[PDB]
Paper text:
We therefore set out to characterize two previously unstudied proteins from the shipworm symbiont Teredinibacter turnerae that were initially identified by the presence of carbohydrate binding domains appended to uncharacterized domains with probable redox functions. One of these was TERTU_3803, which contained both a CBM10 and a CBM2 domain attached to a range of distinct modules (via flexible linkers) that did not bare any sequence similarity with catalytic domains typically found within carbohydrate-active enzymes. Using a ‘module walking’ approach, we searched for other genes coding for these X-domains. This led to the identification of TERTU_2913, which lacks CBMs but contains predicted X122, X183 and X132 domains. Taken together, these sequence analyses suggested that TERTU_3803 and TERTU_2913 could have a role to play in cellulose metabolism, and furthermore that role is likely to be a redox one given the presence of cytochrome domains within their linear amino acid sequences.
In addition to our work on Ttpf08450-X173, we produced TtX122A and TtX122B, representing the X122 domains from TERTU_3803 and TERTU_2913, respectively. The electron density was readily interpretable allowing two molecules of TtX122A to be modelled in the asymmetric unit without breaks in the chain representing residues 3 to 244 of the protein coded for in our construct. Three molecules of TtX122B were present in the asymmetric unit, with chain B’s electron density most readily traced allowing modelling of residues 2 to 235 without breaks in the chain. Chains A and C had some areas that displayed more disorder, so there were breaks in the model between residues 190 and 192 in chain A and residues 162 and 165 in chain C. In addition to protein and water molecules, two magnesium ions were modelled into the electron density on each protomer in TtX122A based on coordination geometry and bond lengths [Fig. S4(a)]; these ions presumably bound from the crystallization medium. To check the oligomeric state of our TtX122 structures, PISA analysis was performed, which revealed that there were no significant molecular interfaces between protomers in the crystal for either structure, suggesting that the molecules would be expected to be monomeric in solution. Our subsequent structural analysis therefore focused on single protomers from each structure. The overall structures of TtX122A and TtX122B reveal that these domains adopt a β-jelly-roll fold [Figs. 4(a) and 4(b)].
Numbering used by the authors:
A (entry chain A): 3 to 243
B (entry chain B): 3 to 242
The structure:
């Protein structure tokens, strides 16, 4: 196991970029103007949190607001996990293009080569660049499970790459499966241009934040972020029974 | 006096970025992957032109496709002019957010500090960043003169900065005035946060291409670009 990382943001000052992360803010990797005087930012906030005093607050829209972690070389799989609290919903949303909260990217400079989880065409799901292909197919658009605004959610994304006949992704909300990609028919536009191994070269950086391709501004808070190459799950506290 | 530049793209090979220019492609300055293999690019094209063999061809959308050039230190005003041919129109367009063809920017790496001329809220006009203000005001949105698709146009933008009480911008189509920013009431949202000197710091680079904030893909061709600190207008051949 090459990575087993957790961050509750408790050690960073309020209004500062999380210590130990990079950023991708307003389309620039490690934007030097990620601060409280800007309209788009990714900063520690002590006004909402799932555990302890602090979370990370993403304020963005069309312009992305993200924190970025470098992943170890040669991962075949990765698990991204966080407590997530959003100003708006994902899923079952008319007129959506696509929006995402979680992802991985191959090149730090670009949003050009990456896998993007949140919603596509108003269903919870995934956009890949550079194909710009989307999952699920048209059939399911503007429907399906909702990730509600204004409440804390335990979101896990499992990405299974490496030496397997078709690369997979499964997303879970409070430990319930909500979205899967496990064959080529799950994509709308012919399956990432025929490519069965569609996570190859994607697993270099992990990112978290807000990025709307539907022209929607949002405020998103996350806490207790985890990144691992072994499965991650949510505890009863996180499930909020 | 400080700049008098022209480019018809005739010396650059087809499918190559225009010689002597930088780029802003896919939100990256001097993107190394500005080439005919990509879905977003700014490349010389000999299949359409206004004069000679060649034009520059911008293919982009929400992801920008632009060529960029430095401007000399000290400019207090600039004129941007080009023959322009576009796959869609600007102006009189319901549902538009904003889209632009011409601009100037302060910092090469970002689209974060710049004046954007094309349409705002479906009326020919201007967006400034970082204020995100727009002109004209809301009374005129989704109306006004059209810059039509599928035909060659001569577009000129005058930007008047430096030591004057209020910075100004005037845009012209085939020598007819189509848009003006003369005073603070021309802005929708309070006038660039009350800054009268709103061109200051903006005249470091000129840029041209296609950049939509309305999620519209386009192809745009330009030729016979001029950039000067002295006025420019369209000649007899350009008016057609
Ligand atoms: Ca915390
Ligand atoms: Ca030419
Ligand atoms: Mg919950
Ligand atoms: Mg845990
Ligand atoms: Mg004409
Ligand atoms: Mg001339």
């Amino acid at each position: 196991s090459l990575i087993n990382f957790t961050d509750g943001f408790e050690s960073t000052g309020v209004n500062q970029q999380p210590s130990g992360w990079g950023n991708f803010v307003g389309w620039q990797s490690n934007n030097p103007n990620n601060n409280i005087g800007q309209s788009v930012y990714a900063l520690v906030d002590n006004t909402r949190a799932f555990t302890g005093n602090n979370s990370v607050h993403f304020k963005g829209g069309a312009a992305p607001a993200q924190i970025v972690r470098t992943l170890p070389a040669g991962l075949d799989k990765v698990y991204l996990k966080a407590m997530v609290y959003m100003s708006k919903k994902l899923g079952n949303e008319a007129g959506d293009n696509h929006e995402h909260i979680f992802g991985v990217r191959g090149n730090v400079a670009q949003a050009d080569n990456e896998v993007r989880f949140g919603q596509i065409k108003g269903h919870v799901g995934t956009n890949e660049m550079p194909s710009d292909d989307i999952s699920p197919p048209q059939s399911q658009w503007y429907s399906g499970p909702e990730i509600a605004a204004d409440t804390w959610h335990c979101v896990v994304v499992e990405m299974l790459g490496g030496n397997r006949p078709y690369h997979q992704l499964h997303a879970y909300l409070d430990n319930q499966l909500i979205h899967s990609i496990d064959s080529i028919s799950d994509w709308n536009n012919g399956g990432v241009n025929g490519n069965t191994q569609w996570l190859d070269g994607k697993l270099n950086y992990a990112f978290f934040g807000w990025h709307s391709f539907s022209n929607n501004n949002a405020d998103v808070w996350m806490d207790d972020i985890e990144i691992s190459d072994q499965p991650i799950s949510c505890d009863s506290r996180e499930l909020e029974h």
